[PDB]
Design a protein around this ligand. Structure first.
Ligand SMILES: Nc1ncnc2c1ncn2[C@@H]1O[C@H](COP(=O)(O)OP(=O)(O)OP(=O)(O)O)[C@@H](O)[C@H]1O
Ligand SMILES: Nc1ncnc2c1ncn2[C@@H]1O[C@H](COP(=O)(O)OP(=O)(O)OP(=O)(O)O)[C@@H](O)[C@H]1O
Lengths: 175, 180
């Protein structure tokens, strides 16, 4: 496990000090002309640059409305640890009993998403500004990480999303 | 250089006996909460927003304690592979001046005033505490900088100015020369 940090010190999964990429679900793809993008970015007056008719917006960190990132090159290598010390994040949604159901688990109406906590944490880690589509029972939904809502794409009703860890006690650690 | 990631995958300059470390920011340092296992237990219940730990009202929804930012460090540590410093990004901090141009923090305004604080000072604070509000002096005036709003505000006149953070430009030519 090797990580680098993006422009806001976020942990991410090179011959220049910088790597410019845009997120077209499912992948972060390299820009061509990385040195030219960087030169524009190093000028604080510049918010808009267009290369190949792709409109980059440094204020929103978007290109044609897709998220972009600047990876800093310096790499960090994970220290070998017991997996009991790794945080697992669980994702929940506010159900019709106004209680929390874990994603991939059955609702009070015996409906479940295919997506689960592992799926959502992986996506959230890679792309926090990600809006994504998913199915549950007979319905289609849109999940926004930024708003922490899911929305039925037909009825437009929103439900609240929450992200909290699996509890690991000091007893669990010794065990 | 060894780092941990917080609850939002942010790199933090640092393993610890628990898988989690709960801290609050008392300017200018991150301090350990007492009763970390009890905070974590409450946090792992998604219905819990508010707890009291001794004197402290902790708010998981805002990730604040008595209005100070809090963070949860994940314990897995990452050790930086030492490289040529030409591969490290240097961040410059600017403010929009009265000629509607950018002055670097610590450099002269069009009115011959300068902040004490500079790009190194701001990048260090921003890295440690992005939800930080900072007080600073420039000429005879007192200011507040909000990282979240990317604004400075004269605390007397309430005049706001826009803040921008962009790198020192390093070309592929610069890279080749910097390998002695
Ligand atoms: N992520 C999910 N996983 C499983 N079931 C879900 C999920 N989201 C919603 N549901 C189920 O869908 C129903 C909630 O409806 P939904 O959010 O699709 O909007 P709606 O049709 O406008 O409102 P409602 O279905 O309450 O009349 C409930 O049966 C709920 O349990
Ligand atoms: N970070 C800074 N570093 C140096 N000088 C600064 C800085 N911020 C503001 N100044 C200077 O302070 C002077 C007054 O601007 P300031 O933002 O303090 O608000 P102000 O007194 O309300 O100004 P005005 O009334 O002219 O709008 C200007 O010359 C400006 O260049």
């Amino acid at each position: 496990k090797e990580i680098c940090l993006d422009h806001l010190y976020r942990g991410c999964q090179f011959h220049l000090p910088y790597r410019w990429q845009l997120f077209i679900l499912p992948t972060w793809m390299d820009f061509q002309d990385m040195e030219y993008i960087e030169r524009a970015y190093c000028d604080p007056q510049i918010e808009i640059i267009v290369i190949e008719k792709h409109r980059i917006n440094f204020k929103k960190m978007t290109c044609d409305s897709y998220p972009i990132r600047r990876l800093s090159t310096p790499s960090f290598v994970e220290k070998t640890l017991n997996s009991v010390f790794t945080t697992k994040w669980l994702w929940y949604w506010r159900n019709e009993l106004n209680e929390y159901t874990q994603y991939g688990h059955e609702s009070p109406s015996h409906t479940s998403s295919e997506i689960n906590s592992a799926y959502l944490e992986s996506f959230f880690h890679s792309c926090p500004r990600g809006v994504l589509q998913f199915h549950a029972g007979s319905q289609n939904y849109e999940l926004s990480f930024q708003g922490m809502i899911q929305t039925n794409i037909a009825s437009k009703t929103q439900r609240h999303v929450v992200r909290r860890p699996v509890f690991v006690s000091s007893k669990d650690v010794e065990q």
